[PDB]
Coordinates of C-alpha atoms and ligand atoms in Angstrom, one line a residue:
Chain A
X1 CA 0.0 0.0 0.0
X2 CA 3.0 2.3 0.6
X3 CA 3.4 2.9 -3.2
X4 CA -0.2 4.0 -3.4
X5 CA 0.5 6.7 -0.8
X6 CA 3.5 7.9 -2.9
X7 CA 1.2 7.9 -5.9
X8 CA -1.3 10.0 -4.0
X9 CA 1.5 12.3 -2.9
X10 CA 2.7 12.8 -6.4
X11 CA -0.8 13.3 -7.7
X12 CA -1.4 16.0 -5.2
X13 CA 2.0 17.6 -5.8
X14 CA 1.4 17.7 -9.6
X15 CA -2.1 19.3 -9.1
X16 CA -0.8 21.8 -6.5
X17 CA 1.8 23.1 -9.0
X18 CA -0.9 23.6 -11.7
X19 CA -3.4 25.3 -9.3
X20 CA -1.4 28.0 -7.5
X21 CA 0.5 30.9 -9.2
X22 CA 3.6 31.1 -7.0
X23 CA 5.0 27.9 -5.4
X24 CA 6.9 28.0 -2.2
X25 CA 10.1 26.9 -3.9
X26 CA 9.9 29.8 -6.2
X27 CA 8.9 32.3 -3.4
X28 CA 12.0 31.1 -1.4
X29 CA 14.3 31.9 -4.3
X30 CA 12.9 35.4 -4.5
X31 CA 12.8 36.1 -0.7
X32 CA 16.3 34.8 0.0
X33 CA 17.9 36.5 -3.0
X34 CA 19.2 33.3 -4.5
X35 CA 17.1 34.0 -7.5
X36 CA 16.1 36.3 -12.5
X37 CA 15.3 39.9 -11.5
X38 CA 14.5 41.8 -8.3
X39 CA 11.0 42.5 -7.1
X40 CA 9.5 45.9 -6.5
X41 CA 9.7 46.8 -2.8
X42 CA 7.0 48.7 -0.9
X43 CA 8.4 50.1 2.3
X44 CA 6.5 53.3 2.8
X45 CA 3.8 55.5 1.3
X46 CA 5.8 56.8 -1.7
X47 CA 7.0 53.4 -2.7
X48 CA 3.4 52.1 -2.7
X49 CA 2.5 54.9 -5.0
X50 CA 5.2 54.1 -7.5
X51 CA 4.6 50.3 -7.3
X52 CA 1.0 50.9 -8.4
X53 CA 2.3 52.2 -11.7
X54 CA 4.6 49.2 -11.9
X55 CA 3.1 45.9 -10.8
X56 CA -0.5 44.7 -11.0
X57 CA -2.3 45.2 -7.7
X58 CA -5.3 43.5 -6.3
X59 CA -6.8 46.7 -5.0
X60 CA -8.3 49.4 -7.2
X61 CA -9.0 56.5 -0.7
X62 CA -6.9 56.3 2.5
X63 CA -3.8 54.0 2.1
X64 CA -4.4 51.5 4.9
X65 CA -7.9 50.7 3.6
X66 CA -6.6 50.1 0.1
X67 CA -3.9 47.7 1.4
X68 CA -6.6 46.0 3.5
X69 CA -8.9 45.6 0.4
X70 CA -6.0 44.3 -1.6
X71 CA -5.6 41.5 0.9
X72 CA -9.3 40.7 0.6
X73 CA -9.4 40.6 -3.2
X74 CA -6.3 38.5 -3.3
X75 CA -8.0 36.1 -0.9
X76 CA -10.9 36.0 -3.3
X77 CA -8.6 34.7 -6.0
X78 CA -7.0 32.2 -3.6
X79 CA -10.4 30.8 -2.9
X80 CA -10.9 30.0 -6.5
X81 CA -7.4 28.5 -6.7
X82 CA -8.1 26.3 -3.6
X83 CA -11.5 25.4 -5.0
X84 CA -9.9 24.2 -8.3
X85 CA -7.2 22.3 -6.3
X86 CA -9.8 20.6 -4.1
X87 CA -11.5 19.1 -7.2
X88 CA -8.3 17.0 -7.8
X89 CA -8.3 15.3 -4.4
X90 CA -9.3 11.7 -5.1
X91 CA -12.8 11.2 -3.8
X92 CA -13.7 14.9 -3.3
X93 CA -15.9 15.4 -6.4
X94 CA -17.9 12.3 -5.5
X95 CA -18.9 13.9 -2.2
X96 CA -22.4 15.2 -1.8
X97 CA -22.5 18.7 -3.3
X98 CA -23.6 20.5 -0.2
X99 CA -20.7 18.8 1.7
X100 CA -18.2 20.0 -0.9
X101 CA -19.4 23.5 -0.5
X102 CA -19.3 23.2 3.3
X103 CA -15.8 21.8 3.4
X104 CA -14.6 24.7 1.2
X105 CA -16.5 27.3 3.1
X106 CA -14.9 26.4 6.4
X107 CA -11.4 25.4 5.0
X108 CA -10.3 28.3 2.8
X109 CA -9.3 30.5 5.7
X110 CA -7.0 28.0 7.3
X111 CA -5.5 27.2 3.9
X112 CA -5.0 30.8 2.9
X113 CA -3.1 31.5 6.2
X114 CA -1.1 28.3 5.6
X115 CA -0.1 29.2 2.1
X116 CA 0.5 32.9 2.9
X117 CA 3.4 31.7 5.1
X118 CA 5.0 30.3 1.9
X119 CA 5.1 33.9 0.6
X120 CA 6.4 35.5 3.8
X121 CA 9.6 35.8 5.8
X122 CA 10.2 37.8 9.0
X123 CA 10.8 40.9 6.9
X124 CA 7.8 41.0 4.4
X125 CA 5.5 39.2 2.0
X126 CA 5.6 38.6 -1.8
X127 CA 2.6 40.0 -3.7
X128 CA 1.5 40.1 -7.3
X129 CA 2.9 36.7 -8.1
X130 CA 6.3 37.5 -6.7
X131 CA 6.9 40.7 -8.6
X132 CA 6.4 42.8 -5.5
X133 CA 7.6 42.6 -1.9
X134 CA 5.8 44.6 0.9
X135 CA 7.7 45.0 4.1
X136 CA 6.5 43.9 7.6
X137 CA 7.6 47.3 8.9
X138 CA 5.3 49.2 6.5
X139 CA 2.3 46.8 7.0
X140 CA 2.7 46.8 10.8
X141 CA 2.8 50.6 11.0
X142 CA -0.5 51.2 9.3
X143 CA -2.9 53.3 11.3
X144 CA -5.8 52.5 13.7
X145 CA -6.8 48.7 13.6
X146 CA -5.1 47.9 10.2
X147 CA -1.6 47.7 11.5
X148 CA -2.6 45.2 14.2
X149 CA -4.6 43.3 11.6
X150 CA -1.5 42.6 9.5
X151 CA 1.1 41.7 12.1
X152 CA -0.5 38.5 13.5
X153 CA -0.1 37.0 10.0
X154 CA 3.7 37.4 10.1
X155 CA 3.9 36.1 13.7
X156 CA 2.1 32.9 12.5
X157 CA 4.1 32.5 9.3
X158 CA 7.4 32.8 11.1
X159 CA 6.6 30.0 13.5
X160 CA 5.1 27.9 10.7
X161 CA 8.0 28.3 8.4
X162 CA 10.4 26.9 11.0
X163 CA 9.0 23.5 10.1
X164 CA 10.7 24.0 6.7
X165 CA 8.0 22.3 4.6
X166 CA 8.3 22.2 0.8
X167 CA 5.5 22.1 -1.7
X168 CA 5.3 18.4 -1.9
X169 CA 4.6 18.4 1.9
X170 CA 2.1 21.3 1.6
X171 CA 0.1 19.7 -1.2
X172 CA -0.9 16.9 1.1
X173 CA -1.3 19.0 4.2
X174 CA -3.7 21.4 2.4
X175 CA -5.7 18.4 1.3
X176 CA -5.9 17.1 4.9
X177 CA -7.4 20.5 6.0
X178 CA -10.1 20.5 3.4
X179 CA -11.2 16.9 4.3
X180 CA -12.1 17.8 7.9
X181 CA -15.1 15.8 9.0
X182 CA -15.9 18.1 12.0
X183 CA -17.1 21.1 9.9
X184 CA -20.6 22.3 11.0
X185 CA -23.5 21.1 8.9
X186 CA -21.9 18.2 7.0
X187 CA -24.5 15.6 5.9
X188 CA -22.2 12.6 5.3
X189 CA -19.1 12.7 7.5
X190 CA -18.0 9.1 6.9
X191 CA -16.6 9.4 3.3
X192 CA -14.8 12.7 4.3
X193 CA -13.0 11.0 7.2
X194 CA -12.3 8.0 4.9
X195 CA -10.5 10.3 2.5
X196 CA -8.8 12.2 5.2
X197 CA -7.6 9.0 6.8
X198 CA -5.8 8.3 3.4
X199 CA -4.3 11.7 3.1
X200 CA -3.0 11.5 6.7
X201 CA -1.3 8.2 5.9
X202 CA 0.2 9.9 2.9
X203 CA 1.3 12.9 4.8
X204 CA 3.0 10.7 7.4
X205 CA 4.9 8.7 4.8
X206 CA 5.9 11.8 2.8
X207 CA 7.3 13.5 5.9
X208 CA 9.2 10.4 7.0
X209 CA 10.9 10.1 3.6
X210 CA 11.4 13.8 2.8
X211 CA 12.6 14.8 6.3
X212 CA 14.1 11.6 7.8
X213 CA 16.1 13.6 10.4
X214 CA 13.1 15.6 11.6
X215 CA 11.6 13.5 14.4
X216 CA 7.8 13.6 14.9
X217 CA 7.4 16.3 12.3
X218 CA 4.0 14.7 11.4
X219 CA 2.9 15.2 15.0
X220 CA 4.3 18.8 15.1
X221 CA 2.6 19.7 11.8
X222 CA -0.8 18.4 13.1
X223 CA -0.3 20.6 16.2
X224 CA -0.1 23.6 13.8
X225 CA -3.8 23.0 13.1
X226 CA -4.3 24.3 16.6
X227 CA -2.5 27.5 15.6
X228 CA -4.6 27.7 12.5
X229 CA -8.0 27.4 14.2
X230 CA -7.0 30.0 16.9
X231 CA -5.9 32.6 14.4
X232 CA -8.9 32.1 12.0
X233 CA -11.2 32.7 15.0
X234 CA -9.4 35.8 16.2
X235 CA -9.2 36.9 12.5
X236 CA -13.0 36.9 12.4
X237 CA -13.2 38.9 15.7
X238 CA -10.9 41.4 14.0
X239 CA -13.0 41.8 10.9
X240 CA -16.0 42.5 13.1
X241 CA -14.3 45.4 14.9
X242 CA -13.1 46.9 11.5
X243 CA -16.6 46.6 10.0
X244 CA -18.3 48.2 13.0
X245 CA -15.9 51.2 13.0
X246 CA -15.0 51.9 9.4
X247 CA -17.6 53.4 7.1
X248 CA -15.0 55.1 5.0
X249 CA -14.7 51.6 3.5
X250 CA -17.4 52.2 0.9
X251 CA -17.1 49.9 -2.2
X252 CA -19.6 49.4 -5.0
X253 CA -22.3 47.0 -3.8
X254 CA -21.3 44.4 -6.5
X255 CA -17.7 44.3 -5.1
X256 CA -19.2 44.0 -1.6
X257 CA -21.2 41.0 -2.8
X258 CA -18.1 39.5 -4.3
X259 CA -16.1 39.6 -1.1
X260 CA -18.9 38.9 1.4
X261 CA -16.9 35.7 2.4
Chain B
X1 CA 15.2 8.6 18.7
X2 CA 14.3 5.9 21.2
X3 CA 14.4 2.1 21.0
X4 CA 10.9 0.6 21.0
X5 CA 11.5 -1.1 24.3
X6 CA 12.4 2.2 26.0
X7 CA 9.1 3.6 24.7
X8 CA 7.1 0.7 26.2
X9 CA 9.0 1.3 29.5
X10 CA 8.0 5.0 29.3
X11 CA 4.4 4.1 28.7
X12 CA 4.2 1.9 31.7
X13 CA 5.9 4.5 33.9
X14 CA 3.3 7.1 32.9
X15 CA 0.3 4.7 33.3
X16 CA 1.6 3.7 36.7
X17 CA 2.0 7.3 37.9
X18 CA -1.4 8.2 36.5
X19 CA -3.0 5.5 38.6
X20 CA -1.2 6.8 41.7
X21 CA -2.1 10.4 41.0
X22 CA -5.8 10.3 40.1
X23 CA -8.5 9.0 42.4
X24 CA -11.2 8.0 39.9
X25 CA -9.7 6.1 36.9
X26 CA -11.6 5.9 33.6
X27 CA -11.9 2.1 34.0
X28 CA -13.6 2.6 37.4
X29 CA -15.8 5.3 35.8
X30 CA -17.0 2.9 33.1
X31 CA -17.8 0.2 35.6
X32 CA -20.0 2.6 37.5
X33 CA -21.7 4.1 34.4
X34 CA -22.4 0.9 32.5
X35 CA -23.6 -0.7 35.7
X36 CA -24.4 -4.4 36.1
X37 CA -23.0 -3.9 39.6
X38 CA -25.0 -3.9 42.8
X39 CA -22.1 -2.3 44.8
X40 CA -20.7 0.5 42.6
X41 CA -24.1 2.0 41.9
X42 CA -24.7 5.8 42.0
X43 CA -27.4 8.0 43.4
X44 CA -28.8 10.0 40.5
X45 CA -29.5 13.8 40.8
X46 CA -32.0 14.8 38.1
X47 CA -34.0 17.6 39.7
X48 CA -34.2 19.9 42.8
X49 CA -35.7 17.2 45.2
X50 CA -33.1 14.6 44.4
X51 CA -30.4 17.2 45.0
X52 CA -31.9 17.8 48.4
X53 CA -31.9 14.0 49.0
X54 CA -28.3 13.6 47.6
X55 CA -26.9 15.8 50.4
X56 CA -28.0 13.3 53.0
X57 CA -26.7 10.3 51.0
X58 CA -23.4 11.0 49.2
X59 CA -29.0 29.0 45.5
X60 CA -28.8 25.8 43.5
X61 CA -26.9 26.9 40.4
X62 CA -24.2 28.5 42.5
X63 CA -23.8 25.5 44.8
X64 CA -23.3 23.3 41.7
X65 CA -20.8 25.8 40.4
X66 CA -18.9 25.7 43.6
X67 CA -19.0 21.9 43.5
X68 CA -17.4 22.0 40.0
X69 CA -14.8 24.6 41.1
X70 CA -13.7 22.7 44.3
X71 CA -13.2 19.6 42.2
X72 CA -11.3 21.5 39.5
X73 CA -8.9 22.8 42.2
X74 CA -8.3 19.2 43.4
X75 CA -7.9 18.3 39.8
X76 CA -5.2 21.0 39.4
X77 CA -3.5 19.5 42.5
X78 CA -3.6 16.0 41.1
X79 CA -2.4 17.0 37.6
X80 CA 0.5 18.9 39.2
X81 CA 1.5 15.8 41.1
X82 CA 1.3 13.7 38.0
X83 CA 3.4 16.3 36.0
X84 CA 6.1 15.9 38.6
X85 CA 6.6 12.3 37.5
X86 CA 7.0 13.0 33.8
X87 CA 10.7 12.3 33.3
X88 CA 12.4 15.6 32.7
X89 CA 9.6 17.9 33.9
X90 CA 11.1 18.8 37.2
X91 CA 14.5 19.3 35.6
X92 CA 13.0 22.2 33.5
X93 CA 13.5 25.8 34.4
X94 CA 11.2 26.6 37.3
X95 CA 9.3 29.4 35.6
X96 CA 8.6 27.1 32.6
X97 CA 7.2 24.4 34.9
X98 CA 4.7 27.0 36.1
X99 CA 4.0 28.1 32.6
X100 CA 3.4 24.6 31.3
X101 CA 1.0 23.8 34.1
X102 CA -0.7 27.2 34.0
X103 CA -1.8 26.6 30.4
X104 CA -2.2 22.8 30.5
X105 CA -4.4 22.1 33.4
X106 CA -7.6 23.3 31.7
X107 CA -7.0 21.2 28.7
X108 CA -6.4 18.2 30.9
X109 CA -9.3 18.8 33.2
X110 CA -11.6 18.8 30.2
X111 CA -9.9 15.7 28.9
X112 CA -10.3 13.8 32.1
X113 CA -13.8 15.2 32.8
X114 CA -14.8 13.2 29.7
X115 CA -13.8 10.0 31.4
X116 CA -16.6 10.7 34.0
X117 CA -19.2 11.4 31.4
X118 CA -21.7 9.8 29.0
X119 CA -24.3 11.5 26.9
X120 CA -26.7 11.5 29.9
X121 CA -24.5 12.9 32.8
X122 CA -21.4 13.1 34.9
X123 CA -20.0 11.2 37.9
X124 CA -19.6 13.2 41.1
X125 CA -18.4 12.5 44.7
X126 CA -15.8 10.0 43.6
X127 CA -18.4 8.1 41.7
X128 CA -21.1 7.9 44.4
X129 CA -23.3 10.3 42.6
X130 CA -24.4 11.0 39.0
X131 CA -25.8 14.3 37.9
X132 CA -27.7 14.4 34.7
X133 CA -26.9 16.5 31.7
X134 CA -30.5 17.6 31.4
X135 CA -30.6 18.9 34.9
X136 CA -27.3 20.7 34.5
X137 CA -28.2 22.2 31.2
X138 CA -31.4 23.6 32.6
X139 CA -29.8 25.7 35.3
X140 CA -30.7 29.4 35.4
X141 CA -29.0 32.6 34.2
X142 CA -25.6 31.8 32.6
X143 CA -24.9 28.6 34.4
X144 CA -27.0 26.2 32.3
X145 CA -25.1 27.0 29.1
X146 CA -21.8 27.0 31.0
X147 CA -22.4 23.3 31.9
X148 CA -23.4 21.9 28.5
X149 CA -20.2 22.5 26.4
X150 CA -18.3 20.1 28.7
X151 CA -20.8 17.3 27.6
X152 CA -20.6 18.3 24.0
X153 CA -16.8 17.8 24.1
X154 CA -16.9 14.6 26.2
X155 CA -19.3 12.8 23.8
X156 CA -17.0 13.5 20.8
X157 CA -13.8 12.7 22.7
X158 CA -15.1 9.5 24.2
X159 CA -16.0 8.2 20.7
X160 CA -12.2 7.5 20.4
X161 CA -12.6 4.8 23.1
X162 CA -9.3 5.6 24.9
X163 CA -8.4 3.8 28.1
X164 CA -6.3 5.0 30.9
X165 CA -3.1 3.7 29.6
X166 CA -3.6 5.8 26.4
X167 CA -4.7 8.8 28.4
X168 CA -1.7 8.8 30.7
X169 CA 0.5 9.5 27.7
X170 CA -1.9 11.9 26.0
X171 CA -2.1 14.0 29.2
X172 CA 1.7 14.2 29.4
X173 CA 2.0 15.3 25.7
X174 CA -0.4 18.2 26.5
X175 CA 1.7 19.4 29.5
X176 CA 4.9 19.3 27.5
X177 CA 3.8 21.7 24.8
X178 CA 6.7 24.0 23.7
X179 CA 4.3 26.5 22.0
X180 CA 2.9 27.8 25.3
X181 CA 3.2 31.6 25.8
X182 CA 6.2 32.9 27.6
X183 CA 8.4 29.8 27.8
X184 CA 12.1 30.5 28.3
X185 CA 13.6 27.3 26.8
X186 CA 11.4 25.6 24.2
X187 CA 14.0 23.1 23.1
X188 CA 14.2 21.0 26.3
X189 CA 10.4 20.9 26.4
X190 CA 10.2 19.7 22.8
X191 CA 12.8 17.0 23.3
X192 CA 10.6 15.6 26.1
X193 CA 7.4 15.9 24.0
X194 CA 9.1 14.2 21.1
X195 CA 9.7 11.3 23.4
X196 CA 6.2 11.3 24.8
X197 CA 4.7 11.6 21.2
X198 CA 6.9 8.6 20.1
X199 CA 5.5 6.8 23.1
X200 CA 1.9 7.8 22.4
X201 CA 2.3 6.7 18.7
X202 CA 3.5 3.2 19.7
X203 CA 1.0 2.8 22.5
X204 CA -2.0 3.6 20.2
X205 CA -0.6 1.3 17.5
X206 CA -0.5 -1.6 20.0
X207 CA -3.6 -1.0 22.0
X208 CA -5.9 0.0 19.1
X209 CA -4.3 -1.9 16.1
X210 CA -7.5 -1.9 14.1
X211 CA -8.1 1.9 14.7
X212 CA -6.4 3.5 11.8
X213 CA -4.7 6.9 12.3
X214 CA -5.9 7.1 15.9
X215 CA -2.7 9.0 16.7
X216 CA -3.5 11.7 14.2
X217 CA -7.2 11.8 15.2
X218 CA -6.2 12.1 18.9
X219 CA -3.8 15.0 18.1
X220 CA -6.6 16.7 16.2
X221 CA -8.5 16.6 19.5
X222 CA -5.8 18.9 21.0
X223 CA -7.3 21.5 18.6
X224 CA -10.7 21.2 20.1
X225 CA -9.3 21.6 23.6
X226 CA -7.7 24.9 22.8
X227 CA -11.0 26.4 21.5
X228 CA -13.1 25.1 24.4
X229 CA -10.6 26.3 27.0
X230 CA -10.8 29.8 25.5
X231 CA -14.6 29.8 25.4
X232 CA -14.5 28.6 29.0
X233 CA -12.5 31.5 30.3
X234 CA -14.6 34.0 28.3
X235 CA -17.7 32.5 29.9
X236 CA -16.3 32.6 33.4
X237 CA -15.5 36.3 32.9
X238 CA -19.1 37.1 32.0
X239 CA -20.4 35.1 35.0
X240 CA -18.0 37.0 37.3
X241 CA -19.6 40.3 36.3
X242 CA -23.0 39.2 37.6
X243 CA -22.2 36.8 40.5
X244 CA -20.4 38.1 43.7
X245 CA -19.4 33.5 44.3
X246 CA -15.6 33.8 44.4
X247 CA -12.7 31.6 43.1
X248 CA -10.1 29.5 44.7
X249 CA -6.7 31.3 44.7
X250 CA -5.1 28.4 42.7
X251 CA -7.7 28.9 39.9
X252 CA -7.5 32.7 40.4
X253 CA -3.7 32.7 39.5
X254 CA -4.1 30.4 36.5
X255 CA -6.6 32.7 34.7
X256 CA -4.5 36.0 35.1
Ligands
LIG1 O1 -2.4 42.7 -4.0 C1 -2.3 43.5 -3.0 O2 -2.5 44.7 -3.0 C2 -1.8 42.9 -1.7 C3 -1.6 43.7 -0.6 C4 -1.2 43.2 0.6 C5 -1.0 41.8 0.7 C6 -1.2 41.0 -0.4 C7 -1.0 39.5 -0.3 O3 -1.9 39.0 0.7 C8 -2.2 37.7 0.6 C9 -1.8 36.9 -0.5 C10 -2.1 35.6 -0.6 C11 -1.6 34.7 -1.7 O4 -1.2 35.3 -2.7 O5 -1.5 33.5 -1.6 C12 -3.0 35.0 0.4 C13 -3.4 35.8 1.4 C14 -3.1 37.1 1.5 C15 -3.6 37.9 2.7 N1 -4.8 37.6 3.2 N2 -4.9 38.4 4.4 C16 -6.1 38.3 5.1 O6 -6.3 39.2 5.9 C17 -6.9 37.1 4.9 C18 -6.4 35.9 5.3 CL1 -4.8 35.7 5.9 C19 -7.1 34.7 5.1 C20 -8.4 34.8 4.6 C21 -8.9 36.0 4.3 C22 -8.2 37.2 4.4 C23 -8.8 38.5 4.0 F1 -9.8 38.3 3.2 F2 -9.3 39.1 5.1 F3 -8.0 39.3 3.5 C24 -3.7 39.1 4.6 C25 -3.4 39.9 5.7 C26 -2.1 40.4 5.7 C27 -1.2 40.1 4.7 CL2 0.4 40.8 4.8 C28 -1.5 39.3 3.6 C29 -2.8 38.7 3.6 C30 -1.6 41.5 -1.5
LIG2 O1 -19.7 18.7 43.5 C1 -20.7 19.0 42.7 O2 -21.8 19.3 43.1 C2 -20.5 18.7 41.2 C3 -21.6 19.0 40.4 C4 -21.5 18.8 39.0 C5 -20.3 18.3 38.5 C6 -19.2 18.1 39.4 C7 -17.9 17.6 38.8 O3 -17.2 18.5 37.9 C8 -15.9 18.3 37.6 C9 -15.3 17.2 38.1 C10 -13.9 17.0 37.8 C11 -13.2 15.8 38.4 O4 -13.9 15.0 39.1 O5 -12.1 15.6 38.0 C12 -13.2 17.9 37.0 C13 -13.9 19.0 36.5 C14 -15.2 19.3 36.9 C15 -15.9 20.4 36.3 N1 -15.3 21.6 36.2 N2 -16.1 22.5 35.6 C16 -15.7 23.8 35.3 O6 -16.5 24.6 35.1 C17 -14.2 24.1 35.4 C18 -13.4 23.4 34.5 CL1 -14.0 22.2 33.4 C19 -12.0 23.6 34.5 C20 -11.5 24.5 35.4 C21 -12.3 25.2 36.2 C22 -13.7 25.0 36.3 C23 -14.5 25.8 37.2 F1 -13.8 26.2 38.3 F2 -14.9 26.9 36.6 F3 -15.6 25.2 37.7 C24 -17.3 21.9 35.2 C25 -18.4 22.3 34.5 C26 -19.4 21.4 34.2 C27 -19.3 20.1 34.7 CL2 -20.6 19.0 34.3 C28 -18.2 19.6 35.4 C29 -17.2 20.5 35.6 C30 -19.3 18.3 40.7

């Protein structure tokens, strides 16, 4: 059966590469400097202004709001990328349609956070498919509640990146998150746990072979699902406070529908 | 790291201490709950009158709260004594010992409270009593809905069918979490947990060989514990702003 898990691992790796614009391997080359050309750096107001005329941005008057909304609309794309990737997990599309929607609804936040770490180091985050790099200093120093909305993401990423996972590890881990049988309102939990039981076996085997000197990394990576749940819940508490205080965040109602999460 | 026979030695050490540290084992809890026993049989409290009769045998919502609290404090004492036997714990920096306990006792109390529960109620008074979920859930003000989440967790956790020899290692793994806030030396804590995790993995493989990926499923329960402990502390705060009950100093320090 071991070679079936390696086949599942490779299948997920291959699909992961097709689904997401910027892999972690490629992000690491950019971030470390062992890379091709150099990304545009946003480190203060003026450099943001020039970058807009340079790289494609996910936003479209105050600066902190625009950066916030850029994070949201980039998340809207990541949802579609994750949704396409989920369809390639063996067994997923045969699940009850309402269950597929439920798993995605409750999993995209944990996966976005997870994959955002691939694009971050302690000093900043890649944006616009790696062509830009926005610094932690600038993001953290944004006004009112936006500064303190950005910084928790880096604090998570820095801890998570200490596990030193590569894309072949992450392709299976992401699948494990999606196939969580404890999401509220699932109709048929059994086939979801059956699939997740397979992915877990594959994650375990992948980690033992790809990180043979990293003891109990499997266990440590599952413990990171504690950090993911925590931060997604406080994330939601943060969005509420922003929405109940900021009515200078007026968008066209159609855009508001699009990002309603 | 370890040879398999050292891990089995570690499992037995922890099971043995667990038995010495905790009054009411899960095996004894299941013997009382499932029944078929004329001697181990509990008095059942399901309403006000049976609560009045239970006092002679073995405000109402507050008195039950104080019953839960006094037992939690004893639980903290028992967990602390058990922690002292986990190899390496007492050799850790003294502030880290406090830190690990401060953040681990709530997750463990919840874990071990499940052992005393079924879907219909909870053992009390070292097993001599049994208070029903229905009665607890129906308490007034904020206390009814403070009781029910414990049952909601217990039913899910007990579906794993762990016995005490599994739980002894699981409890140790929780205590030795290197990701607790404010630890000074995470590495020695992680070396110990790597050993405890290796021991848990082997214990579950041998004691539940037909239960695939139980190790992973049990670790995913440490996620549920983090959420519920947080909701617990948030509920206690709201209750404190209406009820002037008071808390034991041991619990008082832990929640600061
Ligand atoms: O294009 C621009 O203008 C832009 C400007 C700033 C940052 C980014 C890149 O941001 C991301 C890229 C990717 C990616 O490419 O894989 C994924 C996520 C983010 C990102 N989501 N997020 C959130 O709050 C968030 C999260 Cl974590 C999860 C779910 C939903 C959201 C929300 F919808 F609410 F946003 C961030 C907060 C801080 C930072 Cl620093 C980054 C993110 C792009
Ligand atoms: O003596 C009576 O009258 C009595 C009547 C009902 C139940 C119990 C037994 O309860 C427990 C026994 C044991 C044990 O035996 O090891 C352990 C825990 C509880 C228990 N703690 N708790 C809490 O809110 C709590 C918790 Cl989880 C953790 C830390 C602090 C507290 C707090 F201090 F705030 F209470 C409960 C809530 C509901 C239920 Cl059902 C049980 C508990 C005794």
